[PDB]
Amino acid sequence: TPMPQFVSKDGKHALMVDGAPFLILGAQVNNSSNYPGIMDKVWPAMQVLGPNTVQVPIAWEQVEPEEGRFDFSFVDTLLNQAREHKVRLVLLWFATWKNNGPQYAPHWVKTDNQRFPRVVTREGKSIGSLSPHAQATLDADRKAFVAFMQHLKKVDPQHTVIMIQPENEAGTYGSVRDFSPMAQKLFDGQVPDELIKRMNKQPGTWAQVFGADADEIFHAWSIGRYIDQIAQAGKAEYPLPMYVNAALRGPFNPGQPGQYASGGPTDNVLDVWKAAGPHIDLLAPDIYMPEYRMYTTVLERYARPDNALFVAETGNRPEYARYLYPTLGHNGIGWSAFGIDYTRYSNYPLGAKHVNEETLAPFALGFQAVSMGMRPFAKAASEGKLHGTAEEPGQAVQELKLNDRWSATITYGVPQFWFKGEPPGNPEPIGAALIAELSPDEFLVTGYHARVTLHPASDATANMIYDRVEEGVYEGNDWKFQRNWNGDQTDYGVNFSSVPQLLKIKLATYK
Amino acid sequence: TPMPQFVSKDGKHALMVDGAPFLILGAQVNNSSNYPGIMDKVWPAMQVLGPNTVQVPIAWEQVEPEEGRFDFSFVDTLLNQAREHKVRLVLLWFATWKNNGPQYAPHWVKTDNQRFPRVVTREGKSIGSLSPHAQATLDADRKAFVAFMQHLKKVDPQHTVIMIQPENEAGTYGSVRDFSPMAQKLFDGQVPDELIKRMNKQPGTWAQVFGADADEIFHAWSIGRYIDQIAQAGKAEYPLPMYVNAALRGPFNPGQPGQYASGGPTDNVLDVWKAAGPHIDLLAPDIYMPEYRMYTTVLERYARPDNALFVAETGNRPEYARYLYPTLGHNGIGWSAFGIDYTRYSNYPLGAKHVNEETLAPFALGFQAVSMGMRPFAKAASEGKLHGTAEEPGQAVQELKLNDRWSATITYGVPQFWFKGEPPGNPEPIGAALIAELSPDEFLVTGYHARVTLHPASDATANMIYDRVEEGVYEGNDWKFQRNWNGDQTDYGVNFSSVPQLLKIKLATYK
Amino acid sequence: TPMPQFVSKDGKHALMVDGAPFLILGAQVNNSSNYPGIMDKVWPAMQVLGPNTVQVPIAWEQVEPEEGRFDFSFVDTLLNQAREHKVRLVLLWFATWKNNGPQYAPHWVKTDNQRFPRVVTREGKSIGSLSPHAQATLDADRKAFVAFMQHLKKVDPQHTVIMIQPENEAGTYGSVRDFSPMAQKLFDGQVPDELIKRMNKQPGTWAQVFGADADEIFHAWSIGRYIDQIAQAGKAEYPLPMYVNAALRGPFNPGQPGQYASGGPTDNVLDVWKAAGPHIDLLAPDIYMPEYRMYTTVLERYARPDNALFVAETGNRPEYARYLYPTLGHNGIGWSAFGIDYTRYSNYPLGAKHVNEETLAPFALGFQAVSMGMRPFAKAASEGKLHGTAEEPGQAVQELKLNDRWSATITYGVPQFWFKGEPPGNPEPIGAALIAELSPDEFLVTGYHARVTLHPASDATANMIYDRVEEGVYEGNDWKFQRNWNGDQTDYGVNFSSVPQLLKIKLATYK
Amino acid sequence: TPMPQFVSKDGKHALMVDGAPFLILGAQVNNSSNYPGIMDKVWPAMQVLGPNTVQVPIAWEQVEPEEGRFDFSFVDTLLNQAREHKVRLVLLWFATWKNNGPQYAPHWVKTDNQRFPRVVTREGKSIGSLSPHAQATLDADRKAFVAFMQHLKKVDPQHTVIMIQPENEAGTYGSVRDFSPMAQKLFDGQVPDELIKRMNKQPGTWAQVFGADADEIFHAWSIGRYIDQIAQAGKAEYPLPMYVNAALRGPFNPGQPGQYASGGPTDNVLDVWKAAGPHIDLLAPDIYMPEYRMYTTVLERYARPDNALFVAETGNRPEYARYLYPTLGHNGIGWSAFGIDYTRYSNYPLGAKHVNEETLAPFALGFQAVSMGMRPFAKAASEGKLHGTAEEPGQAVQELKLNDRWSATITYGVPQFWFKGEPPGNPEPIGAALIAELSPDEFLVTGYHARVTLHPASDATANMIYDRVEEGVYEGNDWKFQRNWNGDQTDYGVNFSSVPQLLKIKLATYK
């Protein structure tokens, strides 16, 4: 009965849950959906979407409303509800930083700018972001987080909670770093040796070592060390996997640090964050860029040999749903949609104007399909054998290289039969496909609004035979056969529309 | 267990109901919805709208169909039904005047123009309005009203009925005053001393004292004294608060008296009516002017230090619903929509072509929101601490000054998140906000189709902190907490859509 | 317990049913809806429409399928069903003529053109209409009709059946008369004395007496005498009222006889039919002319001092519904819509493409309204005191003279409140009003999509007072009060929309 | 209690089921709807459509997954379900050929191109079609088919299964014939004597006898003999009727053999297939040509004196539904729509994008109408006395010759009453009519979106009388009368809309 753990070796990764790889199919409630009196607007939405994991804020202001006086009653209530509604949990520690700011820190923290000081701009102004350099703020956050992880260990031997997110989009808007004297005395000092090593540099001060990027790298290092110390102390009580989430900078035309949240784990300081954070298992992007080229580039930059891809947040508008499968195709640990409840809040223009059964349906389709084979899909991801893709506007055909023997053509917006002319694509980009290689000649295949045409990748497989195309579902790891597709259903690839269908396809050659 | 009473001192007012301030959230049935056989088309509409007070006609013709033979059986039935359906009552005495005319007076009154004479025009014609100068008509109305108030005292110790409206839009169409000899002998006489005092004038006859306005002021005085005598005699039996309602003249381009109902409490004879009517607690406007500038000007003119604002009637078309909150913002006693039943009558073009759940929804939203905190809202109004505003077409932003420390920006038609560009306003003007100052740093806030952004009003509060933003409801005066809004839900003001939500917002500063 | 009877004296008429005047609010099933196995598609439509009288074919071919072998089992079944579904019946004897033809005569009649000969054209051709001159055909029809009326007397002491229609649109298409030798020997003879008397003519042969109209008048006389003899023999067994129905000729631009059904009771041979038919109580028009001027002219021509108006058939398209009230305004005996069942037959373009709750609603509204006061309305018609009108396209205002004291203005398509501008009319012509004078100052008033404004018709009533405007219903002749309309509901006339409402309006004058 | 049998003599044909002629009103499930776990998406669609016969694949790969190891469990389950849901079955043997290919043959067949060789092109390439010349493939298919028919005999004494289809669209895409040496040695040989006889030719080799068509005729003969041998061996175990289905070549502009499936029973090798296949009862077209002229021409070419017409497959788009009645008008054995289940597969553009109650309704209408008289309709077809027609775009009138005495005019898109102008046709071509001659003067008539006007075909019947027009249904062969249509319902022909109605019309003449 092992607890959840994150493993990563030689560029292959797994979130182990109950002793086997697990893929997070996640939903995050809105930021103020973290009280008993509002949960009856959370669970009905989850029942429609059907995530296997729900992200919920655990606010520092609610568990330590007065210093030393802890209250974990909402954690207790939430664990009971998640167990009743059959989901795992990822708890979000809203503390020193939530979207750069201290708004979720307790009254006795965020109103006391002397004991818990804010970042000071170069021009001398205090701004709405707590300085990472103050020992008092670190001590207070870590104490509450330690008490949190101690409580969790006592009341969750079921391991309902599988990961913790310490802080939420840490970083600073409105200044590249802290310019207070306390900060400057550290910025004037020598760059720590660990960072010199990891960055392949020569010793010196921050200004000497990093030049024009010293301010931003200093801030990223200082935030990273701050959260790493919290993660280390919490893991000493209850060593759940832990990750931080990034408010992104633009992948192609980023602004200046401070326009984006400086110091957060943005795509230019990933090495700094890895060096600062040996106790942080991964750096997760929060992706609200609906354009295909931007979204998929962010996925590629955060999927590294030293970083399992977890899309911790993404939009809940219907065009976002299709990005689930390409995310899983990077063989990370999963993907989560943000803003899933019926509280009538909307983060439009980032997300949907409303959350209801219609807006959730495109998301539920993928969650249902993956859930039909989640443990085999997760095993495949743990071995780097998952492939996934989403439809790009203006391109009705994609090619997926599977292995030496087979490839898959993905065609969007076509009939499930012979068609004349070039594939038109779906009227809106809504298609996706997901393929796991189970063995060299057998694949798990699902998709929607799309045709998947497996075909030979070499002369050795030119004489292709469909041996079986079994529709069915897995119970855990046991395959439950429904029917063998054949005839019209495989003559023009295998075609998916709007219902979740999993196909276990065994290929052969005639000899 | 005190009876209802109206208190007013130094420009602050309260309708005391069950020993505490009360705000009327009212609905008035149509003019012929005052019989047992039609009430099953009243209560289903009230169940949807959810008023806390219902206005119903009590017709002189129904309670004294023959002289001396009183019948209060409908009053009895109505009290039972209002108690069953959990509303308070305001009873409208349809007697000497209903919309200037005697149509609701009994057969033995309105067919006898000798004993109960009509106004005579300057040219000698009797018109459809009873003369205020006839002692017989005053005596007969007052007798029936006294018997009415005696009956009410006996059968309503519960105080279901909280106010009485003697007469209904008294005044005269088609003549500025009565020109009959009976009238002229009074018009030739000396202006009574009380009116000379209140009007800051020198003694004389009506023509000497008031000049070109003598005819209209004489008529207003004479009607005012007539109704005051009825109110005084009724209050001697059962001293419920009492008010009269005004058919309005145009605020900017009024016609001549007689085109509008001359002698009624129009905005140019309010002092005359106050002098004539020490036993009439307030002069209430009936507002069927949907244009923002006209509607809000009428509110300002009738909200005086000597006159608590009560909007006794207003339209039931959807654009009217938003005027509830600016009305309450004048710290009067409430607001009532006219024409609320399912009898299939329509007073379009003044009001809605139909009354159903769709047309009532915009009204129900505000009634539900205010009802969630009605007694605290009424306490705030009794202290002059209520603020309210409605959306004006072409203006997407309003500013509300709250106190020395805080103000509120009201923004219409915007996302509940960051938006680029100037606020567009709602496509139709439908937004409103209502704010009560509970203490210098704590406010009750609700609105719809609107964003409320509290912000510093002085250098002393520049370092603004949201201490709590508690969503919840009051049970009487006891606050029932649901959740604390934070994060996305307060980063861009607090945003309201189409559901009733009450926020108790405590502000702080970091130090 | 009297049987139904028709009375007519000095231009005033009544269908007496159960000892008092009765107004037929009728529905006729389609022509093949006269068998047990199809009645379950009749009664559900009647339940929606709510007629008080249903017309049903009784086919000669079904009650005498072989000569001498009578079968009245469907009559028995139908009486049971009409009693169960609470309607009266008018039975249509489909025999020698149905729409000019013998198609409903038994096999042994309509296939035997020797014993039962057809009309012969001038050029020698037999056409699809039976000759009225053959004694064999008269004898056979009359025998079956006598057996029919004998059976009815035995099995209907309840008087479910209130009238009989002998034949159905008798007349001849394709020839003005019979030109066979049998016919010519009668045409050559002397005009019978009774017809010479009634037509104010001098004796002679048909050609001498009537000139160019001799052929058509001869045919009308001969058909009239034929049916009169059947009616006389049937009435001798069971003297129910009896009427014949007319396929109309054009009121303004009629064709030639034979294009229209020559010999039928068309508007130019009404005197001939009255002379030929002393045992036929009335001549009823079948009106499928939707244009206002044509429809109302037909009503005027068939409403005579010697002819009570009964609209035996009219269209079931929605524009026809409004013609009910002007029909009743001629103080005849009622009005019936044709084609009322759910068999999925349509007589479009004459009638509606479908029969369902939507197409029936405009008809049901009037039937419900009249049924709320049917016996008082019928009493008023029996005295010539009913007034009715329907909306004409392009005319939004009509005036109804009621008596010396009062008139009514009918205004179409206006608000139920003050409106600026000229009345626009309803977008389609759908309005109607019905007014019964109960006494000189009291009226029964109903309407739909219309305003009724009673107003003085003389200087004596200039000082008009609404004494009562009672909404309610009658149970038999007992008035059941609901409420008194007043205020807004009578300030702009009394306004009717889409629900059935009956108002008993007592007018007064102030003195 | 006879088993099903096919009889054909002198150009008249019958499928005898339970001892009497039977007309297949068929539905075929999709190609992968042949497993227990998917049948719950078959029967709900059949319940809506209401076929009397369902076609289901029986796949060689499922009944002999390993050689010698038979498994008929799905056959057993399917028989139980068809009996429960009250349909007959036609089982489709998916074996050596399914749409030219071996995809439904077992693993040990289709992956072994040595023992079970594919067709070789002229240029030397193996293509996806099994060669008919290999004795091993014939032996293996026939063995499995024999075991299949043996099993069926044991478990289906109820005769739920009425026909078998050996193979499915046999033929070859991509080559006119096999060019392998094995094939060429047969092609070089002498044409068998039976084919020389039937083709009215002189002896010789294939190239000598048939010239430019030798390749295609050789292939058709070789496939025909292959399947005939299977049919003969299966019939020896259980002699159910058997048929083959044809992937069609274009009727007017066919491509080359190999573009269409060469060797299949295309319209140019019907004589070859008749000569090769004395044990194959008929050659059935699969018609996915929606254009009227192409569809009806295919019907005419496959309806031969030596070939009963069975439309084994046709489209499930709504325009196809109307082709049922003209198919039955060729006096064959029935008609079946392809793709009838709720699995969410679509063979659009050939068929409908979706299968649901709306898309099935036009098909269900005809199935319900024919089912109301199926055994009399089948008796009439067995005697060549069925007549049927469908609406052609641009032609609103058709004439059907019935016999010497009567004809029927079919008019599309007109009212059920008199209309002015030329018939417009239905907006889309949707009408059809079906007429059985029961005796010289009595007909069974049904249709939809159409008028049927019976009229004289000779001077002897000029004096036409409708004797009876009985609406009703048959229970087996017993007529159950509902009503006699007359009057309006027969004055303008008999008119059909969207509900199933069967009329038994007896015609007479008056004398």
Short mmCIF file of N, CA and C in Angstrom, two decimals, chain D residues 5 11 21 31 48 58 65 78 105 138 160 168 185 195 198 233 257 288 308 323 336 370 372 392 472 501:
data_model
loop_
_atom_site.label_atom_id
_atom_site.label_comp_id
_atom_site.label_asym_id
_atom_site.label_seq_id
_atom_site.Cartn_x
_atom_site.Cartn_y
_atom_site.Cartn_z
N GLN D 5 -38.36 -21.48 -48.57
CA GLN D 5 -37.90 -21.93 -49.87
C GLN D 5 -38.18 -20.85 -50.89
N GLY D 11 -41.13 -16.73 -64.87
CA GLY D 11 -40.97 -15.32 -64.57
C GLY D 11 -41.70 -14.82 -63.35
N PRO D 21 -46.03 -16.90 -49.60
CA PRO D 21 -45.12 -15.83 -50.02
C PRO D 21 -44.90 -14.79 -48.94
N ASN D 31 -21.26 -3.10 -40.34
CA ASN D 31 -20.37 -4.25 -40.55
C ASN D 31 -19.74 -4.78 -39.27
N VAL D 48 -37.59 1.10 -33.76
CA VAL D 48 -38.14 2.28 -34.41
C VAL D 48 -38.46 1.99 -35.87
N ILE D 58 -22.29 -12.84 -40.23
CA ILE D 58 -21.67 -13.95 -39.52
C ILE D 58 -20.27 -14.10 -40.09
N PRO D 65 -12.00 -19.09 -35.37
CA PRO D 65 -10.83 -18.24 -35.09
C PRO D 65 -9.53 -19.00 -35.21
N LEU D 78 -27.85 -14.51 -31.30
CA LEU D 78 -28.58 -13.70 -32.26
C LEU D 78 -29.95 -14.29 -32.55
N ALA D 105 -11.91 -13.12 -43.15
CA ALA D 105 -11.37 -14.46 -43.00
C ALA D 105 -10.50 -14.54 -41.75
N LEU D 138 -11.05 -22.48 -51.30
CA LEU D 138 -12.39 -23.02 -51.47
C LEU D 138 -12.70 -24.06 -50.41
N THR D 160 -36.26 -19.04 -37.92
CA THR D 160 -36.00 -17.61 -37.77
C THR D 160 -35.20 -17.09 -38.96
N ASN D 168 -19.79 -11.65 -49.52
CA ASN D 168 -20.38 -10.31 -49.54
C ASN D 168 -19.64 -9.48 -50.58
N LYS D 185 -3.07 -20.87 -66.45
CA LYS D 185 -3.22 -22.24 -66.93
C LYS D 185 -4.69 -22.60 -67.12
N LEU D 195 -20.85 -23.30 -69.93
CA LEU D 195 -20.83 -21.88 -70.25
C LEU D 195 -20.98 -21.65 -71.75
N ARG D 198 -24.79 -22.00 -72.37
CA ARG D 198 -25.63 -20.91 -71.88
C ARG D 198 -25.37 -19.61 -72.63
N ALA D 233 -22.76 -27.17 -51.18
CA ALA D 233 -22.39 -27.95 -50.00
C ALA D 233 -23.18 -27.52 -48.78
N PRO D 257 -13.51 -2.90 -65.65
CA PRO D 257 -13.45 -3.92 -64.58
C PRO D 257 -12.12 -3.81 -63.83
N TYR D 288 -26.60 2.10 -54.20
CA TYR D 288 -26.29 3.37 -53.56
C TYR D 288 -26.19 4.47 -54.62
N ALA D 308 -35.40 -13.10 -59.62
CA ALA D 308 -36.25 -12.33 -58.71
C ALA D 308 -35.48 -11.16 -58.12
N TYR D 323 -37.78 4.42 -52.64
CA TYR D 323 -37.50 3.39 -53.63
C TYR D 323 -38.03 2.01 -53.22
N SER D 336 -34.08 -3.88 -48.61
CA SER D 336 -33.44 -3.72 -47.30
C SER D 336 -32.57 -2.48 -47.28
N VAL D 370 -46.67 -1.40 -45.58
CA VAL D 370 -46.62 -2.73 -46.18
C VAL D 370 -46.92 -3.79 -45.14
N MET D 372 -48.95 -3.71 -42.77
CA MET D 372 -50.40 -3.78 -42.60
C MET D 372 -51.08 -4.72 -43.59
N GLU D 392 -40.14 11.12 -59.16
CA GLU D 392 -38.96 11.60 -59.87
C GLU D 392 -38.92 13.11 -59.82
N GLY D 472 -58.25 -0.15 -43.49
CA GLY D 472 -58.15 -1.21 -42.50
C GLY D 472 -56.79 -1.86 -42.56
N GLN D 501 -51.41 4.07 -44.20
CA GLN D 501 -52.82 3.75 -44.37
C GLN D 501 -52.96 2.81 -45.56
#
